[PDB]
Design a protein around this ligand. Structure first.
Ligand code: CLA
Ligand code: CLA
Ligand code: CLA
Ligand SMILES: CCCCCCCCCCCCO[C@H]1O[C@H](CO)[C@@H](O[C@H]2O[C@H](CO)[C@@H](O)[C@H](O)[C@H]2O)[C@H](O)[C@H]1O
Lengths: 49, 69
């Protein structure tokens, strides 16, 4: 019951690292095999590249 | 049997231990409290852990202008 429980904190965020960012309102507009997004990477190690 | 550096010589003798150095730089209690927060503690150390680590991390990142990755 500590199960089901952790499956929804997964699912919630699955739907919540979507819809401030990473399209729908471009992917529905009509979605051609380019690269629709889950989430935003943020690592300090990154270069500009 | 003259030569031998007749008990040569000894030391007192080959002891060492009993006073080899005056111990320590004066500083007596030039600190004593002086800074307490580890000199106070009972009880602390969380308190500090959220503080130090909250700045380090908080300003450690955010802003001013990017300078980005
Ligand atoms: C060698 C290291 C270096 C380091 C230190 C990092 C570090 C990081 N990279 Mg990264 N990266 C690197 C090289 C590196 N990268 C390289 C060469 C590339 C290829 C270009 C990338 C490509 C890349 C991408 C695309 C992303 C990152 C992301 C990240 C961050 C993960 C964010 C996160 O949720 O917290 C760290 C991880 C966690 C908090 C959870 C991870 C789960 C692991 C640790 C399992 C252990 C948990 C265990 C089961 C529970 C008990 C353990 C206990 C200790 C609690 C992290 C800061 C990502 C990011 O910023 O996400 C938001 C993003 O995905 N990197
Ligand atoms: C225990 C060890 C070691 C250390 C830590 C010191 C430390 C010191 N010695 Mg010293 N000394 C040592 C071995 C050491 N000595 C030995 C083996 C000898 C025999 C060669 C001496 C012969 C000696 C003399 C003649 C003097 C000192 C002095 C001093 C002090 C200079 C402070 C001052 O009054 O204003 C000046 C401040 C400084 C010099 C600070 C700078 C620190 C370093 C880099 C020099 C300082 C506390 C001076 C003193 O005050 O005592 C009478 C004095 O000039 N020492
Ligand atoms: C993981 C850690 C731990 C835990 C369990 C909590 C838990 C909580 N913090 Mg919190 N906090 C923490 C560490 C923690 N904090 C740390 C380290 C800091 C920095 C010092 C803070 C600074 C902080 C602030 C400023 C606030 C909280 C608040 C809260 C509560 C509301 C959470 C929320 O906004 O979502 C709920 C979001 C929803 C959209 C659901 C709303 C449904 C109802 C309420 C309507 C919750 C009890 C908030 C609070 O409760 O004050 C009134 C307040 O905003 N925290
Ligand atoms: C068996 C032990 C070794 C040999 C026998 C006994 C030695 C130890 C006990 C005797 C004490 C030594 O003799 C001496 O002690 C102190 C030296 O610090 C002195 O009292 C002392 O107080 C100050 C404390 O900073 C010292 O720096 C002064 O040099 C000193 O006057 C006494 O003037 C004298 O009694």
């Amino acid at each position: 019951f500590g199960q089901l429980a952790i499956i929804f904190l997964w699912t919630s965020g699955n739907l919540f690292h979507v819809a401030w960012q990473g399209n729908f309102e471009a992917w529905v507009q009509d979605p051609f095999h380019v690269r629709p997004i889950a989430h935003a990477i943020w690592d300090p190690h990154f270069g500009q590249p | 049997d003259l030569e031998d550096l007749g008990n040569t010589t000894g030391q007192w003798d080959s002891y060492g231990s009993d006073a080899p150095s005056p111990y320590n730089p004066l500083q007596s209690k030039l600190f004593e409290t002086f800074a307490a927060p580890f000199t106070k503690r009972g009880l602390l150390l969380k308190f500090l852990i959220l503080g130090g680590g909250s700045t380090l991390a908080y300003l450690s990142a955010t802003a001013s202008g990017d300078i980005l990755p």
